[PDB]
Amino acid sequence: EKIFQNVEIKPFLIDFSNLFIKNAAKKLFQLEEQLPLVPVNVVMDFKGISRAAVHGLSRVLQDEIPNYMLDIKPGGYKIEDSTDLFMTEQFIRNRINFIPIYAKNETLVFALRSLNNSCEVKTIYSRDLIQVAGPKLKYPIFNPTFEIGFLQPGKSLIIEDIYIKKGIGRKHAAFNLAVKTHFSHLDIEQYPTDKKEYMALSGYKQSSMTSDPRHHRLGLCFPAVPLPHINQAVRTYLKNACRIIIGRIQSIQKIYENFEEPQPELVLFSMDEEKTKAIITIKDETHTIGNLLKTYIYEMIPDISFVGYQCVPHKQEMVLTIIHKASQEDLITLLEKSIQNIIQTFQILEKNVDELIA
């Protein structure tokens, strides 16, 4: 049913009742209201779902959902002769790559044509990132308050090909989306760890080597979503994460369905006492899919001889090993139905996302 229960969405807002904050924002940004893009803290309660699935959703939302960043095309940084010698290409590119953007269009291209004709050091801000291509921006994709850099007197900084690049966060952290805010299990009792007799323990009354929590509270912060369309952005993020997990799982469903053909990413044995060993190696696969697969195969086959995976940091792959007292067809059927259960779980998650955020 409703696996994804109550959600609390709370944007992070500048408190302008603070005199110093308001004075600084007014004097150097002429800003009296909240910024166009705000960090949004989404706290989600999940009931009746394995911790593997909730943590897989969290991991995907962190650094496995595709994201967009601003990058400079090679040759975009103009060397020229009056350019600032302290604002190197590498420093400025690092600053630009990590500006959180909420971009709905990949075609947008920006430029930074800054010049310091004063006698003092001038600071380049994100408000100086002028759009030079793509459709005219009806809403900003980044906040104009970032300090891109500072120009020495008489110096300039021209960057001409600041474009929008897509990727995932595990390849490069500039595509990281969600920062972790809270994770807890609501169906495991907790100690009062303020006491000296519990402060060396996690706090949970059950050892993690035996506990199987099914009620979780997951809090994730999204770095820059538009102020009016907060719920829409959060819903899109959650649904996209669920779809990403479903697609990556279907990538293995296809491998199972092609088991009669000897594909290199799935091998099967006939070890001994009716037991067959299934080893599924998938390159560039993370702990999300391996842990989801192991958990759901285990849930389908509680009497399994062995199920386990390993994502060695080198070899850049996930290897899942299943040993079961069954035929190869029987084991493949069981694995297929476990994958179907994973897909059904995340489809229900997507549906509940739609019904909740609304």
Partner: protein
């Protein structure tokens, strides 16, 4: 001189086909495996003479060339007596019997690993090459348990690595200089490798009877997950239900059943200096393994530690061979690390802080020491210090002061009253033999005492 003809040019040599890089740790490498960056694997080459039996295997290397890995760099033509670079060898496209192909280093190749200074017989050992295909890695990765061969650590140490390319040198590297031959010290006749640091304390935590949460048990899923990275044939859990609870000793025995040994010894965990304090569990203070079954007791430095004569790995080597001992070291290390993946281990500033009562007790002990020293001084003032023959009054007074200011063995009582042995990371590191000593804990928590230079 050291840099003359003999010692520099004759007794030593500068050599080609050799690499050097910083070494880091890699828990997923076997003890007889070294991680080789792919950039170095395409620099160092293996000379493979082309014959009929290996032409099909050498064909992919030739076709890949220097463009894709695994490839090659040079081909020696038999009928030309000339080497040709592969990039310029577009017009040859023909490998003849008697040709020598210089192909890239691949996973499974033998390589000589060396750390300087080379003081021991194990300072040069042969490891199986595991090529790290990540281009961002330029370190020589090795298992932390292999460091005992070279007296190495990962604080900036650099090691030489060269891959034998000749058939004779490769044969002898595989058969003679493999690190399985240096598992037993030529010096002390005992084992060289074993669990170090994280794995020693992890073995203790896994095999200890009771945790602060109760009995040290895990469900079937976590018992299975302990064997995920062991890289051997996993045991069978078909007779275990998800609700069933397995002890750490049960899974350890499931690992140790492959090479059954008999072991009976008290662990490092059980010390008489801690016996007046603590509450030693009866099942923890006597380690017994019967035919691979860990009947009782914890596994720590005495049983699984590196250089532990009579330890479980020494027995495994004696009964099944040193290579089996290396494989068992890797497997037990994986078990311990996968256990601590859930148990967790830490050290905190509060782990080394005495309670106010224990602080007052330590102050009283130090005050009694200073009182005895002041009594000796009062005796000196009255001329009551009478040295023995052959000792001056100054030397006798110095000996009296040195003995008076020694910390009593009861200095551990306030330390251990402030310590929970079940949750103290510092104490558990010290007591299990993973790292640290009783003087370390006393210096950190109670007091340094008397500084002695040349006794």
């Amino acid at each position: 001189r050291k840099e003359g003809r003999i010692r520099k040019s004759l007794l030593g040599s500068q050599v080609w086909s050799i690499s050097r890089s910083t070494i880091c740790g890699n828990s997923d490498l076997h003890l007889d495996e070294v991680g080789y960056p792919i950039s170095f694997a395409r620099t160092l080459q293996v000379a493979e003479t082309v014959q009929h039996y290996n032409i099909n295997r050498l064909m992919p290397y030739f076709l890949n060339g220097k463009r894709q890995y695994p490839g090659c760099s040079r081909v020696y033509k038999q009928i030309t007596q000339s080497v040709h670079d592969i990039e310029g060898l577009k017009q040859d496209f023909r490998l003849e019997v008697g040709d020598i192909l210089y192909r890239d280093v691949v996973t499974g190749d033998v390589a000589f690993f060396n750390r300087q200074p080379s003081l021991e017989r194990s300072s040069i050992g042969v490891h199986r090459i595991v090529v790290l295909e990540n281009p961002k890695i330029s370190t020589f990765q090795m298992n932390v348990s292999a460091c005992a061969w070279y007296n190495a650590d990962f604080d900036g140490d650099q090691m030489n690595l060269w891959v034998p390319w000749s058939v004779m040198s490769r044969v002898e590297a595989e058969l003679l200089c493999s690190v399985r031959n240096w598992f037993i010290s030529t010096k002390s006749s005992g084992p060289v490798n074993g669990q170090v640091q994280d794995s020693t304390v992890g073995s203790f935590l896994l095999t200890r009877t009771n945790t602060p949460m109760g009995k040290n048990v895990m469900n079937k899923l976590h018992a299975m997950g302990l064997f995920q990275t062991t890289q051997t044939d996993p045991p069978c859990f078909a007779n275990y239900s998800p609700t069933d609870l397995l002890d750490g000793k049960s899974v350890v025995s499931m690992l140790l059943r492959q090479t059954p040994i008999n072991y009976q010894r008290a662990p490092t965990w059980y010390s008489e200096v801690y016996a007046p304090y603590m509450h030693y569990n009866k099942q923890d203070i006597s380690t017994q393994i019967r035919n691979g079954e860990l009947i009782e007791g914890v596994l720590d430095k005495k049983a699984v530690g590196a250089g532990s004569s009579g330890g479980i790995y020494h027995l495994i080597s004696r009964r099944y061979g040193p290579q089996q001992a290396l494989k068992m070291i890797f497997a037990t290390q994986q078990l311990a690390l996968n256990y601590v993946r859930n148990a967790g281990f830490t050290v905190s500033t509060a782990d080394m802080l005495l309670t106010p009562e224990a602080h007052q007790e330590v102050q009283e002990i130090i005050n009694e020491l200073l009182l005895e020293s002041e009594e000796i001084n009062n005796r000196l003032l009255h001329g009551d210090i009478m040295p023995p023959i052959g000792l001056t009054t100054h030397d006798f007074y110095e000996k009296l002061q040195l003995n008076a200011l020694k910390f009593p063995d009861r200095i551990l009582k306030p330390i251990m009253n402030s310590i929970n042995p079940e949750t103290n990371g510092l104490f558990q590191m010290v007591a299990t033999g993973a790292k640290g000593s009783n003087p370390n804990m006393i210096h950190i928590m109670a007091g340094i005492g008397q500084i002695e230079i040349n006794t």
